[PDB]
Design a protein around this nucleic acid. Structure first.
Ligand SMILES: *OP(=O)(O)OC[C@H]1O[C@@H](n2cnc3c(N)ncnc32)[C@H](O)[C@@H]1O
Length: 392
RNA sequence: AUCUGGA
RNA sequence: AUCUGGA
């Protein structure tokens, strides 16, 4: 019933009129101290990798340092920063700054002590924002001091391959087309983000570029805005009604939002959606839940804190089908570990499709169409993805 | 449950 | 994208 009273909506922008955006300026001393920490750790070989990139579109020759951690390092207690996605720079006047700040690393239920359901009830306060987890690759956008718009993927920017478009360049091309539609320029977006001292955080979803799990055809393809972060060492993020307002003003597609006050209603909603893996007539792969947390409870200040809840089925089966389809075209015996009966039928359908049209083999080997193949099989059986997973 | 090690 | 040894 809770999955029928709560619906993900993209119309919270009208409710942002009374809300005020967070803002904090950068302290060069604090930034310098952060970079001193990270520069030492990259020289110990708590491991850190540092990669320097030139910003091609910068009129002043700006450069950025990307800093990458081991994903498990973020469980350690005293790191310099818990940002996942971090680019630093020096302006033309020599001031060291954070150019791009992703979200803090966040974890699944029962992956860490803090993400045990008992810990979430204890240490967190609502309201709780459930944001729909779209599935592609992350794109960061910010504005440099010289007016340049910076577009990055998780850890990189620019293009290496002359043949293949990098993820960061593909995100930039989608942003270009999105601004031209609404008569705005990259320079305009760069000045607004720098004014807010902010990184916009979006998901690139486009099957013509790269297929993942769910299908994003032409009607659903583009940049999905899901966060805005302050470019500072600690983690401060916009409320999601303001994120949706920003998306409308700058031509991003919006990320569905549900607001639930009580934490017990949250688990109830999530464990209910998990049975189908679908909500509001749409396949959902997960939610990111956003709230407030403190150190020792009821004391100290409250900080922005996330956790994710990812639905295992029918998606674990879809990955098995993708892996088995790769086995067919490469001459290997598919590894059918679970969902044995329904998977064996899927493979006979696939072998059948590759006989009619041999051009499919070349497409499936370029990692394209495997998602259309899956839905065409499910249509052929009159089944929904969640039903094939429950056949047991 | 918990405690502890690696990645 | 997160797995894993032991008591
Ligand atoms: O485990 P994981 O890679 O799925 O980690 C989370 C990643 O999911 C992407 N994403 C998509 N939608 C969201 C929302 N609403 N909030 C936060 N992250 C989101 C990001 O690319 C992230 O790295």
């Amino acid at each position: 019933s809770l999955a029928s009273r709560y619906k993900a909506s993209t119309d919270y922008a009208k409710d942002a009129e009374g809300l005020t955006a967070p803002y904090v300026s950068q302290d060069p001393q604090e930034t310098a101290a952060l970079v001193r920490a990270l520069d030492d750790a990259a020289k110990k070989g708590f491991s850190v990798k540092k990669t320097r990139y030139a910003v091609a579109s910068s009129p002043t020759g700006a450069e950025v340092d990307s800093w990458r951690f081991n994903d498990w390092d973020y469980k350690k207690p005293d790191l310099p920063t818990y940002a996942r996605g971090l680019f630093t720079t020096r302006t033309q006047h020599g001031v060291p700054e954070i150019a791009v700040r992703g979200y803090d690393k966040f974890f699944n239920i029962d992956e860490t002590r803090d993400t045990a359901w008992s810990a979430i009830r204890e240490r967190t306060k609502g309201p709780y924002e459930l944001t729909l987890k779209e599935n592609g690759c992350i794109i960061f956008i910010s504005g440099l001091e010289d007016g340049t718009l910076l577009v990055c993927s998780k850890h990189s920017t620019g293009d290496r391959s002359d043949v293949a478009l990098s993820h960061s360049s593909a995100g930039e091309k989608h942003l270009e087309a999105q601004l031209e539609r609404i008569g705005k320029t990259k320079e305009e977006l760069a000045r607004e983000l720098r004014k807010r001292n902010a990184t916009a955080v979006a998901e690139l979803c486009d099957d013509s570029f790269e297929e993942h799990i769910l299908a994003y055809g032409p009607d659903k393809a583009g940049l999905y805005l899901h966060g805005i972060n302050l470019n500072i060492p600690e983690f401060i993020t916009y409320p999601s009604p303001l994120v949706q307002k920003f998306a409308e003003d700058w031509g991003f597609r919006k990320t569905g939002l549900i607001i639930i006050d009580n934490i017990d209603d949250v688990k109830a909603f999530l464990e209910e959606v998990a049975e189908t893996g679908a909500h509001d007539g749409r396949d959902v792969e997960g939610f990111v839940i956003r709230c407030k947390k403190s150190t020792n409870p009821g004391v100290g200040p409250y900080h922005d804190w996330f956790f994710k809840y990812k639905f295992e089925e029918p998606y674990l089966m879809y990955r098995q089908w993708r892996e088995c389809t790769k086995a067919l075209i490469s001459g290997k015996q598919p590894k059918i570990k679970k969902h044995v009966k329904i998977t064996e039928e899927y493979l006979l359908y696939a072998r059948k499709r590759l006989a009619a049209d041999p051009k499919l083999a070349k497409l499936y080997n370029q990692n394209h169409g495997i998602i259309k193949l899956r839905n065409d099989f499910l249509e052929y059986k009159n089944m929904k993805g969640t039903d094939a997973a429950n056949l047991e």
